[PDB]
Amino acid sequence: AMEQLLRAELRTATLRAFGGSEGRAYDTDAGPVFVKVNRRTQARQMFEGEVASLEALRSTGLVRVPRPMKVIDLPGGGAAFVMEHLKMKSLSSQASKLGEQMADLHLYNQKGSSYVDKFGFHTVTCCGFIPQVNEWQDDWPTFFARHRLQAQLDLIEKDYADREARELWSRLQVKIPDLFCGLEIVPALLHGDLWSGNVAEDDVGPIIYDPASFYGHSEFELAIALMFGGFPRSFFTAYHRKIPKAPGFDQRLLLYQLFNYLNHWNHFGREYRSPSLGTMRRLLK
Protein backbone atom coordinates (compact mmCIF):
# COMPACT_ATOMS: atom_id res chain seq x y z
CA ALA A 1 0.00 0.00 0.00
CA MET A 2 0.91 3.68 0.48
CA GLU A 3 2.85 3.28 3.70
CA GLN A 4 4.80 0.29 2.29
CA LEU A 5 5.69 2.15 -0.88
CA LEU A 6 6.96 5.10 1.21
CA ARG A 7 9.03 2.82 3.46
CA ALA A 8 10.58 1.22 0.38
CA GLU A 9 11.13 4.44 -1.61
CA LEU A 10 12.55 6.33 1.37
CA ARG A 11 14.41 3.26 2.77
CA THR A 12 13.10 3.65 6.29
CA ALA A 13 12.07 0.98 8.77
CA THR A 14 9.88 3.40 10.66
CA LEU A 15 7.18 5.64 9.21
CA ARG A 16 5.00 6.92 12.01
CA ALA A 17 2.29 9.40 11.19
CA PHE A 18 2.06 12.49 13.37
CA GLY A 19 0.32 15.86 13.28
CA GLY A 20 -2.94 14.47 11.88
CA SER A 21 -14.51 27.11 1.56
CA GLU A 22 -12.01 29.42 3.34
CA GLY A 23 -12.56 27.60 6.62
CA ARG A 24 -10.15 28.45 9.38
CA ALA A 25 -9.90 27.24 12.94
CA TYR A 26 -9.01 29.78 15.64
CA ASP A 27 -7.89 29.22 19.23
CA THR A 28 -10.31 31.18 21.40
CA ASP A 29 -10.69 32.07 25.05
CA ALA A 30 -13.98 30.20 25.67
CA GLY A 31 -12.75 27.06 23.91
CA PRO A 32 -11.75 26.41 20.32
CA VAL A 33 -13.94 27.43 17.40
CA PHE A 34 -14.09 26.73 13.70
CA VAL A 35 -15.14 29.53 11.36
CA LYS A 36 -16.48 29.09 7.83
CA VAL A 37 -16.30 32.11 5.56
CA ASN A 38 -18.26 32.69 2.39
CA ARG A 39 -18.03 36.00 0.61
CA ARG A 40 -21.05 35.80 -1.65
CA THR A 41 -24.32 37.66 -1.19
CA GLN A 42 -26.37 34.54 -0.35
CA ALA A 43 -23.91 33.33 2.33
CA ARG A 44 -26.22 34.23 5.26
CA GLN A 45 -29.16 32.31 3.80
CA MET A 46 -26.91 29.34 3.13
CA PHE A 47 -25.50 29.38 6.65
CA GLU A 48 -28.93 29.77 8.22
CA GLY A 49 -30.01 26.62 6.41
CA GLU A 50 -26.92 24.87 7.76
CA VAL A 51 -27.72 26.11 11.25
CA ALA A 52 -31.30 24.90 10.89
CA SER A 53 -30.09 21.50 9.71
CA LEU A 54 -27.57 21.17 12.54
CA GLU A 55 -30.23 22.13 15.05
CA ALA A 56 -32.68 19.54 13.73
CA LEU A 57 -30.00 16.85 13.91
CA ARG A 58 -28.97 17.97 17.39
CA SER A 59 -32.55 17.80 18.57
CA THR A 60 -32.61 14.01 17.99
CA GLY A 61 -29.62 13.41 20.27
CA LEU A 62 -28.65 10.51 17.97
CA VAL A 63 -25.62 11.90 16.06
CA ARG A 64 -22.73 14.15 17.05
CA VAL A 65 -22.58 17.38 15.02
CA PRO A 66 -20.76 20.66 15.64
CA ARG A 67 -22.76 23.10 17.78
CA PRO A 68 -23.61 26.25 15.78
CA MET A 69 -22.57 29.46 17.55
CA LYS A 70 -23.04 32.53 15.40
CA VAL A 71 -23.73 33.80 11.87
CA ILE A 72 -22.00 37.15 11.25
CA ASP A 73 -22.57 39.52 8.35
CA LEU A 74 -19.22 40.47 6.78
CA PRO A 75 -18.29 44.02 5.74
CA GLY A 76 -18.10 43.90 1.99
CA GLY A 77 -20.53 41.03 1.62
CA GLY A 78 -21.05 37.45 2.69
CA ALA A 79 -20.98 35.95 6.13
CA ALA A 80 -18.96 33.92 8.59
CA PHE A 81 -20.44 30.95 10.46
CA VAL A 82 -18.76 30.18 13.78
CA MET A 83 -19.23 26.74 15.34
CA GLU A 84 -17.81 24.52 18.09
CA HIS A 85 -14.42 23.16 17.06
CA LEU A 86 -14.04 19.38 16.98
CA LYS A 87 -10.74 17.46 16.66
CA MET A 88 -11.62 15.02 13.89
CA LYS A 89 -10.03 12.21 11.86
CA SER A 90 -11.26 10.20 8.85
CA LEU A 91 -14.15 7.82 9.61
CA SER A 92 -12.67 4.35 10.15
CA SER A 93 -13.00 2.68 13.56
CA GLN A 94 -16.41 4.34 14.18
CA ALA A 95 -17.97 3.39 10.79
CA SER A 96 -20.26 0.71 12.24
CA LYS A 97 -21.38 2.98 15.06
CA LEU A 98 -22.18 5.68 12.55
CA GLY A 99 -24.25 3.21 10.47
CA GLU A 100 -26.29 2.46 13.60
CA GLN A 101 -26.71 6.14 14.42
CA MET A 102 -27.77 7.05 10.87
CA ALA A 103 -30.36 4.30 10.82
CA ASP A 104 -31.70 5.50 14.17
CA LEU A 105 -31.79 9.05 12.78
CA HIS A 106 -33.88 7.92 9.84
CA LEU A 107 -36.25 6.00 12.13
CA TYR A 108 -36.55 8.87 14.64
CA ASN A 109 -39.43 10.68 12.98
CA GLN A 110 -41.73 7.76 12.55
CA LYS A 111 -41.01 6.36 15.99
CA GLY A 112 -41.34 9.58 18.03
CA SER A 113 -44.20 11.56 19.58
CA SER A 114 -44.11 14.57 17.16
CA TYR A 115 -44.50 13.01 13.72
CA VAL A 116 -43.66 15.09 10.64
CA ASP A 117 -46.05 13.66 8.07
CA LYS A 118 -44.80 15.30 4.87
CA PHE A 119 -41.58 15.39 2.84
CA GLY A 120 -39.63 18.65 2.89
CA PHE A 121 -38.46 21.06 5.58
CA HIS A 122 -39.45 24.23 7.42
CA THR A 123 -36.77 26.33 5.73
CA VAL A 124 -34.49 26.44 2.71
CA THR A 125 -31.34 24.29 2.95
CA CYS A 126 -28.51 24.27 0.37
CA CYS A 127 -26.87 21.18 -1.12
CA GLY A 128 -23.53 22.81 -1.82
CA PHE A 129 -24.08 26.28 -3.26
CA ILE A 130 -27.58 25.92 -4.83
CA PRO A 131 -30.67 26.77 -2.72
CA GLN A 132 -33.37 24.13 -2.75
CA VAL A 133 -37.14 24.37 -2.41
CA ASN A 134 -38.32 22.36 0.64
CA GLU A 135 -42.07 23.03 0.24
CA TRP A 136 -43.94 20.28 2.09
CA GLN A 137 -45.48 17.52 -0.04
CA ASP A 138 -47.50 14.50 0.97
CA ASP A 139 -46.01 12.28 -1.71
CA TRP A 140 -42.27 11.50 -1.85
CA PRO A 141 -42.00 10.79 -5.63
CA THR A 142 -43.80 14.11 -6.18
CA PHE A 143 -41.44 15.95 -3.86
CA PHE A 144 -38.33 14.36 -5.35
CA ALA A 145 -39.31 14.73 -8.99
CA ARG A 146 -40.42 18.36 -8.61
CA HIS A 147 -38.18 19.90 -5.95
CA ARG A 148 -35.02 17.90 -6.61
CA LEU A 149 -34.81 16.43 -10.14
CA GLN A 150 -36.91 18.99 -12.03
CA ALA A 151 -35.26 21.89 -10.23
CA GLN A 152 -31.79 20.66 -11.30
CA LEU A 153 -32.90 19.98 -14.86
CA ASP A 154 -34.51 23.43 -15.18
CA LEU A 155 -31.15 24.95 -14.24
CA ILE A 156 -29.45 22.67 -16.79
CA GLU A 157 -31.90 23.76 -19.48
CA LYS A 158 -31.44 27.43 -18.61
CA ASP A 159 -27.63 27.41 -18.39
CA TYR A 160 -26.76 24.73 -20.92
CA ALA A 161 -29.89 24.22 -23.09
CA ASP A 162 -28.98 20.52 -23.25
CA ARG A 163 -31.28 18.69 -25.71
CA GLU A 164 -30.38 15.18 -24.55
CA ALA A 165 -31.13 16.00 -20.90
CA ARG A 166 -34.49 17.52 -21.93
CA GLU A 167 -35.54 14.50 -24.01
CA LEU A 168 -34.38 11.91 -21.49
CA TRP A 169 -36.19 13.75 -18.68
CA SER A 170 -39.37 13.86 -20.74
CA ARG A 171 -39.18 10.06 -20.95
CA LEU A 172 -37.98 9.31 -17.41
CA GLN A 173 -40.43 11.45 -15.51
CA VAL A 174 -43.37 9.17 -16.24
CA LYS A 175 -41.44 6.05 -15.20
CA ILE A 176 -40.57 7.22 -11.68
CA PRO A 177 -43.74 5.88 -9.91
CA ASP A 178 -42.85 2.35 -11.06
CA LEU A 179 -39.90 2.42 -8.62
CA PHE A 180 -42.20 3.25 -5.66
CA CYS A 181 -45.35 1.23 -6.18
CA GLY A 182 -46.31 -1.24 -3.43
CA LEU A 183 -43.99 0.32 -0.82
CA GLU A 184 -44.61 2.43 2.33
CA ILE A 185 -42.44 5.59 2.32
CA VAL A 186 -42.26 7.41 5.67
CA PRO A 187 -40.63 10.87 5.98
CA ALA A 188 -37.18 10.48 7.50
CA LEU A 189 -34.97 13.30 8.79
CA LEU A 190 -31.84 13.29 6.56
CA HIS A 191 -28.41 14.81 6.96
CA GLY A 192 -28.87 15.46 3.23
CA ASP A 193 -25.27 15.56 2.07
CA LEU A 194 -23.60 12.52 3.57
CA TRP A 195 -20.54 12.38 1.37
CA SER A 196 -17.47 10.77 2.94
CA GLY A 197 -15.97 14.24 3.16
CA ASN A 198 -18.74 15.33 5.55
CA VAL A 199 -18.20 12.56 8.14
CA ALA A 200 -15.39 11.92 10.59
CA GLU A 201 -14.68 10.67 14.09
CA ASP A 202 -12.85 11.38 17.37
CA ASP A 203 -11.82 9.06 20.26
CA VAL A 204 -15.46 9.12 21.56
CA GLY A 205 -17.31 8.33 18.32
CA PRO A 206 -18.38 9.41 14.81
CA ILE A 207 -19.15 13.03 13.82
CA ILE A 208 -21.12 14.41 10.87
CA TYR A 209 -21.26 17.98 9.61
CA ASP A 210 -22.11 20.28 6.66
CA PRO A 211 -25.74 19.02 6.56
CA ALA A 212 -28.42 20.08 4.06
CA SER A 213 -31.35 18.54 5.90
CA PHE A 214 -34.93 17.77 4.91
CA TYR A 215 -37.47 14.99 5.48
CA GLY A 216 -37.10 12.51 2.64
CA HIS A 217 -36.94 8.80 1.81
CA SER A 218 -34.28 7.26 4.06
CA GLU A 219 -32.62 5.60 1.04
CA PHE A 220 -31.78 8.97 -0.51
CA GLU A 221 -29.21 9.55 2.24
CA LEU A 222 -27.06 6.63 1.15
CA ALA A 223 -26.86 7.47 -2.56
CA ILE A 224 -24.11 10.13 -2.24
CA ALA A 225 -22.26 7.95 0.34
CA LEU A 226 -22.05 5.02 -2.12
CA MET A 227 -21.42 6.93 -5.39
CA PHE A 228 -18.27 8.81 -4.23
CA GLY A 229 -17.06 6.02 -1.87
CA GLY A 230 -15.07 6.63 1.33
CA PHE A 231 -17.24 4.68 3.75
CA PRO A 232 -16.10 1.35 5.23
CA ARG A 233 -18.31 -1.60 4.31
CA SER A 234 -19.18 -1.95 8.02
CA PHE A 235 -21.04 1.40 7.86
CA PHE A 236 -23.54 -0.07 5.42
CA THR A 237 -23.67 -3.43 7.16
CA ALA A 238 -24.62 -1.82 10.44
CA TYR A 239 -27.11 0.51 8.77
CA HIS A 240 -28.92 -2.24 6.86
CA ARG A 241 -29.10 -4.51 9.89
CA LYS A 242 -31.58 -1.88 11.17
CA ILE A 243 -33.08 -0.71 7.88
CA PRO A 244 -32.81 -3.53 5.34
CA LYS A 245 -32.82 -2.75 1.66
CA ALA A 246 -36.41 -2.63 0.51
CA PRO A 247 -37.41 -4.25 -2.80
CA GLY A 248 -36.21 -2.14 -5.74
CA PHE A 249 -33.39 -0.54 -3.70
CA ASP A 250 -30.82 -0.73 -6.53
CA GLN A 251 -33.10 0.97 -9.09
CA ARG A 252 -34.04 3.77 -6.67
CA LEU A 253 -30.34 4.08 -5.91
CA LEU A 254 -29.76 5.07 -9.54
CA LEU A 255 -32.54 7.68 -9.35
CA TYR A 256 -31.02 9.19 -6.20
CA GLN A 257 -27.52 9.12 -7.65
CA LEU A 258 -28.95 10.90 -10.73
CA PHE A 259 -29.92 13.83 -8.53
CA ASN A 260 -26.36 14.07 -7.23
CA TYR A 261 -24.88 13.87 -10.75
CA LEU A 262 -27.19 16.69 -11.92
CA ASN A 263 -26.25 18.79 -8.88
CA HIS A 264 -22.58 18.25 -9.72
CA TRP A 265 -23.22 19.23 -13.37
CA ASN A 266 -24.82 22.46 -12.14
CA HIS A 267 -21.94 23.09 -9.69
CA PHE A 268 -18.88 21.99 -11.67
CA GLY A 269 -19.96 21.80 -15.28
CA ARG A 270 -19.89 19.36 -18.12
CA GLU A 271 -17.51 16.83 -16.54
CA TYR A 272 -20.77 15.59 -14.96
CA ARG A 273 -22.84 15.58 -18.15
CA SER A 274 -21.83 12.05 -19.09
CA PRO A 275 -22.77 10.40 -15.74
CA SER A 276 -26.03 12.38 -15.62
CA LEU A 277 -27.22 11.33 -19.07
CA GLY A 278 -25.83 7.80 -18.71
CA THR A 279 -27.68 7.34 -15.44
CA MET A 280 -30.93 8.55 -17.06
CA ARG A 281 -30.40 6.03 -19.90
CA ARG A 282 -29.80 3.18 -17.43
CA LEU A 283 -33.07 4.10 -15.73
CA LEU A 284 -34.85 4.00 -19.09
CA LYS A 285 -33.45 0.62 -20.28
Ligand X SMILES: Nc1ncnc2c1ncn2[C@@H]1O[C@H](COP(=O)(O)OP(=O)(O)OP(=O)(O)O)[C@@H](O)[C@H]1O
Binding-site members for ATP are 84-86
The letter for the amino acid at 259 is F
CB closer to ligand X, 162 vs 221: 221
- For 97-120, b where at least 16 C-beta lie within 10 A, e where not — what string? bbbbbbbbbbbbbeeeeeebeebb
Euclidean distance between CA atoms 240 and 132, whole angstroms: 28
Q: Distance between alpha carbon 151 and the CA centroid of its chain, in Å?
A: 17
> Site for its own copies (CB under 8 A): how many residues?
58
78 touching ligand ADP, by CB under 6 A = no
Beta pairing class for 130-131 and 126-127: antiparallel
142 makes contact with ligand ADP (CB under 6 A) = no
How far is residue 254's CA from residue 165's CA, in Å, rounded to a whole number?
A: 16
By beta-carbon proximity to ligand ADP, the closer residue of 23 and 112 is 23
Active-site residue 203, yes or no?
no
Q: Is 213 in the site for ligand ADP (CB under 6 A)?
A: no
Task: Determine if residue 127 is left, alpha or beta; phi over 0 gives left, psi from -120 to 50 gives alpha, anything else beta.
Answer: beta
Q: Toward ligand A1A0O, which CB reaches closer, 64 or 264? A: 264
Tell me the C-alpha to C-alpha distance, in Å, between residue 151 and each of 116, 132, 147, 213, 281: 24, 8, 6, 17, 19
In this structure, how many other beta carbons lie within 10 angstroms of the beta carbon of residue 250? Answer: 8
- Give, as one character, the DSSP assignment of residue 203: S
Q: Can you tell me which of 88, 124, 155, 186 binds ligand ADP, judged by CB under 6 A?
A: 88
Q: Is 210 in the site for ligand X (CB under 6 A)?
A: yes
Nearest distance from residue 54's CB to its own copies, in Å? 18
Site for ligand ADP in 170-199 (CB under 6 A): 197-198
- By a kind-dependent CB cut-off of 5 to 8 A, residue 81 interacts, out of ligand ADP, ligand X, ligand A1A0O, none, with none
Select which of 193, 202, 203, 210 is catalytic: 193
Report yes or no: 224 and 260 within 8 Å, Cβ to Cβ: yes
Regarding 47 and contact with ligand ADP (CB under 6 A), the answer is no
Which residues in this chain contact ligand A1A0O in the complex, by CB under 6 A? 22, 127-128, 193, 195, 210, 228, 263-264, 267
* Interface residues toward its own copies, by CB under 8 A: 2-3, 5-6, 9-22, 24-30, 32-33, 35, 37-41, 69-70, 72, 74-75, 80, 82, 90, 128-129, 158-162, 228, 230, 266-271, 274-275
